[PDB]
Amino acid sequence: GAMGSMERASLIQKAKLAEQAERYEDMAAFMKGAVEKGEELSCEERNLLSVAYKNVVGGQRAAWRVLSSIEQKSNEEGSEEKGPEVREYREKVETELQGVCDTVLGLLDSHLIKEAGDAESRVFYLKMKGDYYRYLAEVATGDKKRIIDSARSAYQEAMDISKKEMPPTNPIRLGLALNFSVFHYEIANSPEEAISLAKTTFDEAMADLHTLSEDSYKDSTLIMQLLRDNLTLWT
């Protein structure tokens, strides 16, 4: 791997510099190198891994959505034939997106999840596995059912652990629930399930805010507001 000669600590340090420079593909490559050293990741390092790949895949998803919209308009009645180029370029972007998802899923399978024993690490990684299968599902049109079921399975395992091992205000638990609710609404065609999950999660967090410090309260309420924003859109 191109990062095999670089110290782990140097890869972490450069990931943080890349973040400051908004060089997210570099950040992801540094964090992939750090994972491939074989040691478990700290909380801070997990979050660098997630921020890096989320920014890379987010750019790809946005591009794919633009291209797919253009392609769909091209396939409307009375649209002029323009040749294979829009499909080809949408496919190019799609294939690159799938490649990034496969890279992340591969890091999780070899060997982040199997060595993660604490609830905070294991839930974090299982949520990531659900997220990247969800991004694969957004572009899938052929195995689609199996991709969807892989996302669902990862999210459900993360949910089961989080409900047993973490308080209802924990930010990783809250972000998991937020994302699993969007899976239900956008991917699984289950808007009622999405709404029920978001509601239950919000209400259970609200009842436990009284236990928190001012700083923890800020962290939890930020995610709660995201649940509220989706519930406003959906109801």
Binding site: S50, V51, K54, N55, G58, A62, K127, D131, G175, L176, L178, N179, V182, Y185, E186, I223, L226, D229, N230, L233, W234
Partner: peptide, 7 residues
């Protein structure tokens, strides 16, 4: 719809 983290 909102999901966790940055875009």
């Amino acid at each position: 719809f909102k999901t966790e983290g940055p875009d």
